[PDB]
Design a protein around this ligand. Structure first.
Ligand code: QQ4
Ligand code: QQ4
Ligand code: QQ4
Ligand code: QQ4
Ligand code: QQ4
Ligand code: QQ4
Ligand code: QQ4
Ligand code: QQ4
Ligand code: YAD
Ligand code: YAD
Ligand code: YAD
Ligand code: YAD
Ligand code: YAD
Ligand code: YAD
Ligand code: MN
Ligand code: MN
Ligand code: MN
Ligand code: MN
Ligand code: MN
Ligand code: MN
Ligand code: MN
Ligand code: MN
Ligand code: MN
Ligand code: MN
Ligand code: MN
Ligand code: MN
Ligand code: MN
Ligand code: MN
Ligand code: MN
Ligand code: MN
Lengths: 180, 180, 180, 180, 180, 180, 180, 180
């Protein structure tokens, strides 16, 4: 099928992220060789989730994203049945053992304003925290509480803009921006 | 002999925990292929001990559990002969170099209330600290002093409930609960 | 979902075989947590293919099985366009650079007689070689030409009978035999 | 307990051999810290078995020794049920896929004459091949058929004499010789 | 600069080949980000050289290609000053210790006829052997002496056609063919 | 060409530093076999940059030095487009996510006074921080703000003096000092 | 030569410590196969030095012990020429970048009182800090300043008593105690 | 001390050869930092011995060189006490299990004629085989029996001439040639 996107994705993200993105995609009946924009996004969203969890303290976060659907919900339940938080309706990306809340991480090519309202209206889980980033460098978190310190968040932002430049250097960014 | 428990134990715990559990069992004349509930427990108790020691600071804990009987007592003695704590009658699981006390870690399928009294009456070592967890998510430590911060203990609790769900998903939990 | 088969499969085959079997299954819309007999088979068929290719000389075989559909056909075509053999209708498992032919490897719980006729009638590619094994220890190859020497084939047979005993030790063999 | 033998055994054999010897010993209710001569022997017998299997061609031997009792018999049965050799009464050490026979490897501190008769009278399996070595450098195989070529057997002999010198250098050989 | 070729090259060849190709290119004042066809070729020519040397016996070939200019000539000289072959004017790719000759390996997108005459007229070293391959599957060696056995050469040919299909699947083959 | 410097450089710095220095040199049309003093310097400057970034907290610094020109500027831009700092005219060595500034690291064989003025006059980027070290042990940073704590800086200084002694032990220091 | 000590030393300390101890011994014309008590001591003193440096913060200590004589003095000089501390007459074991002083670590089988006076009278370097430990569990540091926190020092003490028990379990302790 | 030779030796031979050469030198009271020509030779002689043993079949040679004096003689004795060859007076470099003889490998900067007579007159062990090489490319073995096939010996010769060129490129060869 031979997509420039697909070769760029494989040279741009580390193999562990690429393998994991393929699982979720196939597990949801999507094709990384055909749905190449979504493939690029899932990797990106995956790497952000991973840097995010790296920002905290040793035992701070439980990583929900990157597991398979059944096991992701298994840990979700174990978390709810031991802390007592309400079981979310939709799969979150993380759990903060420090603040005792679930995190939903979104990565957008539009206004951080737009995505967040979209995610807040779908959630209505109240307790679940929302933290979104954009490819231009803005972030936006519930109650203005950004969980991590500035430097951990600054790096994520830097990485997201590197991915943008690399995508645009290959004339792929325009098509990627119109994907979301 | 072919026990569902035994295959689940080997897929659920990491190889280092499984090897170590087998040593202790054989070293005490028990068979992991036949005593599969106890095999599952020893692994679990082993993993809890290991996460527990991971919760502290770099040099905080000496790990007694997981060594062979003779060497476990050797370090126990070295600890007593250098700090001056009373030599316990029964093998503890850890030593806290911060609070200067031995830790006994128990993992229960009953009320944290029941196990602790059972362990306190057998101990009578006074100095030795007791910290027990349950598979439903409660903990219970001497003098309400839980040694680790909440997040390290929360993770242990989460893991213990994942093991429960996985065991029950395979219809093994009922037999495991009636083992203790 | 918790299948004894599924835990046995993961403890019985090496991780590389299990990962690869899952790809092919998901890539063909099958579930290893639900289609556990087929999961066990695909692993077995995979390990046989791998030992088989290990039997020859250094550069003897090209391994078609275990690649993804698109790439498996890519090498198939490269092989046909460089040797000149007829392009098979169905994906083979190997290519013999020594005898210059494609190999179809089957693994059966029935008479080696039955499977081979089934595979010969579906093939009709004439050139493609067929080599089947059973779980009881018989083999059966086109033109009585068994490609490998006796010892390489003897080991495959031994392994196949170990898998049978292990499956039956866990009361899984009866259900597995009725799967084919 | 502190045995010179036990420290010498651990410095003289590689960790994989030492771990494996401990399994078999514990699995048969023997103590390597107390039965140190037998501990030294089992390691030696283990290393000989391993070099022996290394002497053949790639797929020549199946290694029975070093597995646990139940799994060693499992492969034994798979071998018998696929070749058709008679199932031995006693666990052999190897299987020769080339000559299609089981091998019993013995290592002696007495006359190769004595041990072999002892092993032949106990066996009576007829088909099972016997190949014994001594610490002084002699060997002795059924039907004068020594399976491996001279060089592979010469190395085993050399190693066995190195172990003797090292043991005697530490004044352990005399007690070891009187063990058998 | 963002070349589809360049991303495909990095996903198609192993990292060791890509690193080595970059050295030679930079060492000769060429840019892999700009001269992407030549970048793709040098990798290909590199991988062929490496499989080629893998075809012989253990100590058969000395690999000249892939070293830096100064060190490649150093070994060339050591080879000439110890065997007595004439020192080539141009850097060869290999040395055959079996046939005692230097090998020049070429990889072409034109007729194996054309490239070979081009390489023979430039060489005039007489002793130096020439062995060329094409992307369609033909080979062509001096004195019809192809050095390796058929299977080693068949694999090279297969790989070369896989690279062609992958390049064309991405609409890169047409531009690559017009590069040579 | 055989330079004592070049052999000393390869035995004195770790392979990762040596490889990276060669890239930058070749990427700028310099020869490490001929420009051996500059080769020694680039390694040194590289190791200082690396220890420097190791001094901070986990996510403190982004390392600009050691990347290739195009990618170094890519991250530079991502940093500027996400924080809003002015885009430097010249490539810096690091970015401090804590103090939000770019760092220029210089290593001198002259007065820390001289180099700094030279670097300040060329920079005029105002925002970019300057931190220089000498081989005799002095440092010198903008606004007397030395970013790292004393111990991290003390180690760099120690290492720089070890390199001096080693160079002089080989009678290479005099020529190296006259290089700058 | 075959010393029980020598086999115990090799099973008791990790290979890196044993290799390093042998260097220093040979570099000073001592034989670990003959001077086995001193061999045991140098390992012990080495492991203490290593745990000690592990107690501090990331960049706290420079490790002098374990290097070869010439290189140990090279770093010593670099440290003196960059901080300005007086160059010790005798090789210390460490440097504290936090407190800016050299550390001499001694390990004794006598009264911590005796060794320290012996080391203080030989030193007279004033600035160099002295910190000694005993095999019974006492420590003793200059100005009652023990550099590390209690837990790091407690572990060293525990380890030292384990080595004592292991040595005595093998009837080697009595001869070791009379060595010092 | 800083010898160009010593830096060249460390960049020219692999770390395992350099470590091993240092052992033998220190074990014989020689200094690689001062006796740099002998240091270069011992490495060279070591690498030749290692390639030599690599030339044979899997179990062909026992490597005597590179062990410590006591252990080298231990294997020598084990070889003699199991084959029955005469115990050499001087330590050989190898044992050929194929031809049943000890090998003395010499590497010369003079006529292969001179060295061999020197080694034959000192030996007088009759049975011990002698095989010498020169840096110009000639070899010379007892009874014109060169043990290995031409290609294995050709590579050794090539390597020896590379070392010569590298040494001379650094103006070290002249001093090295006058060392022998
Ligand atoms: C153990 C693992 C847990 C995490 C994996 C996650 C990703 C991490 C990978 C590591 C290597 N690092 C750390 C440095 C860079 C790197 O590459 N990365 C990749 C990108 C950046 C990063 O930090 N982390 C974080 C803690 C350590 C670790 O490994 N994951 C993966 C999805 C599910 C999950 O829980 N597990 C558990 C079982 C399966 C698995 O993979
Ligand atoms: C060194 C070791 C000391 C400990 C082993 C213990 C277990 C640890 C394993 C490591 C790998 N990690 C860390 C990340 C995940 C992992 O898998 N695990 C396993 C489960 C979680 C965990 O943290 N830890 C903790 C500190 C580092 C280490 O290794 N043990 C084992 C029993 C006796 C003992 O003292 N030793 C000493 C000699 C034998 C041995 O094994
Ligand atoms: C390189 C690889 C090529 C083969 C993989 C195949 C499997 C092999 C794995 C190796 C490790 N060994 C060898 C000893 C045991 C073991 O575990 N096994 C596993 C079971 C037994 C066996 O022999 N072999 C054979 C040659 C070496 C190798 O690795 N495969 C996998 C499917 C597609 C393919 O071509 N590739 C290429 C890219 C992806 C990949 O995995
Ligand atoms: C894979 C393994 C199969 C064998 C293990 C056996 C031992 C071998 C170890 C290897 C490493 N080498 C080879 C070079 C030196 C070395 O150390 N050694 C140790 C001493 C000399 C030797 O040749 N061999 C031989 C083939 C490759 C291999 O590994 N064994 C172990 C007992 C049961 C069994 O079948 N398995 C299978 C599952 C468990 C396990 O361990
Ligand atoms: C040691 C090396 C010598 C060769 C490298 C060459 C490439 C080989 C890489 C290996 C790994 N394998 C083998 C299996 C697959 C693989 O990836 N590959 C890569 C593609 C296929 C292949 O066979 N080979 C062949 C023998 C073993 C080895 O490594 N080279 C590289 C250029 C100069 C040179 O002489 N050296 C010497 C110093 C620098 C270096 O790299
Ligand atoms: C991941 C890497 C990022 C850094 C590399 C840098 C160098 C580090 C190397 C590591 C190993 N350590 C740490 C202990 C000693 C050592 O050797 N060193 C070498 C000397 C001292 C040091 O701390 N660091 C620092 C964080 C971890 C790491 O690896 N680099 C290299 C240049 C560009 C860049 O960003 N990357 C990213 C892709 C390419 C690459 O190499
Ligand atoms: C890099 C090294 C620097 C130190 C080595 C020292 C020893 C350390 C070994 C490591 C592995 N760990 C850490 C966990 C356990 C272990 O085994 N150990 C061994 C016993 C306990 C310990 O902490 N440390 C400490 C920091 C990391 C490191 O490696 N050394 C050795 C002597 C000279 C010197 O400076 N170097 C530099 C070049 C040569 C060398 O070896
Ligand atoms: C196991 C080892 C036995 C040999 C070591 C010898 C050297 C070999 C090193 C290996 C790695 N390879 C092989 C490919 C390149 C390489 O680097 N090399 C180094 C240069 C070329 C070579 O072939 N060989 C040969 C067989 C495999 C092996 O390792 N030696 C070392 C001296 C004593 C001895 O018997 N032992 C035993 C215990 C200590 C030790 O080191
Ligand atoms: O959790 C998420 N998906 C669960 C697992 C998964 C993986 C791949 N495909 C489908 C589902 C998840 N989804 C999204 C968006 C909206 C909904 C789908 N989508 C996306 O495909 O990415 N944005 C996130 O930020 C996120 O975390
Ligand atoms: O320390 C413990 N046992 C020492 C080593 C050992 C290992 C395996 N089998 C027997 C003994 C230990 N025992 C228990 C319970 C009660 C007593 C036995 N039991 C158990 O088998 O688990 N609960 C713990 O929490 C614990 O730490
Ligand atoms: O196979 C053998 N034992 C099976 C596994 C095993 C391992 C450790 N302890 C007991 C049994 C086996 N036995 C022996 C001798 C005679 C019988 C016991 N013995 C020994 O303990 O060793 N000599 C061999 O050569 C051999 O191969
Ligand atoms: O040896 C070869 N080049 C030496 C090293 C080198 C590497 C990269 N760029 C320039 C030179 C070599 N050259 C070629 C062709 C013809 C001449 C240049 N060319 C090419 O750039 O590739 N075809 C080969 O088959 C070959 O082996
Ligand atoms: O960033 C720097 N150079 C960018 C990359 C590079 C690498 C190798 N050669 C040329 C350029 C950089 N340059 C210098 C000095 C002054 C200018 C050139 N020079 C040097 O060659 O080193 N001093 C630094 O401290 C520094 O960081
Ligand atoms: O630094 C020390 N020695 C430098 C290197 C070295 C290594 C091996 N042998 C001789 C010298 C050093 N010496 C000692 C005692 C007193 C003097 C000799 N001795 C000992 O052999 O150990 N006690 C220490 O605590 C210590 O640190
Ligand atoms: Mn998600
Ligand atoms: Mn999300
Ligand atoms: Mn316990
Ligand atoms: Mn417990
Ligand atoms: Mn197939
Ligand atoms: Mn098939
Ligand atoms: Mn046996
Ligand atoms: Mn036996
Ligand atoms: Mn070339
Ligand atoms: Mn070529
Ligand atoms: Mn720079
Ligand atoms: Mn700089
Ligand atoms: Mn010291
Ligand atoms: Mn000291
Ligand atoms: Mn020698
Ligand atoms: Mn010699």
């Amino acid at each position: 099928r031979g997509s420039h996107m697909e070769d760029f994705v494989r040279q741009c993200f580390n193999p562990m992220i690429v393998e994991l993105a393929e699982k979720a995609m196939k597990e949801y009946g999507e094709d990384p060789k055909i749905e190449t924009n979504k493939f690029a996004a899932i990797c990106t969203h995956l790497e952000v989730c991973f840097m995010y969890s790296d920002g905290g303290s040793k035992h701070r976060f439980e990583i929900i994203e990157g597991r398979d659907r059944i096991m992701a919900w298994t840990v979700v339940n174990s978390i709810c049945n031991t802390t007592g938080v309400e079981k979310p309706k939709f799969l979150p990306d993380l759990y903060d053992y420090k603040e005792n809340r679930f995190i939903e991480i979104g990565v957008t090519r539009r206004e951080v304003h737009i995505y967040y309202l979209e995610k807040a209206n779908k959630i209505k889980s109240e307790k679940t925290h929302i933290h979104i980033f954009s490819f231009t460098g803005e972030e936006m978190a519930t109650k203005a509480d950004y969980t991590l310190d500035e430097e951990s968040r600054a790096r994520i932002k830097t990485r997201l803009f590197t991915i943008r430049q690399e995508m645009a250097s290959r004339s792929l960014w325009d098509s990627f921006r119109q994907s979301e």
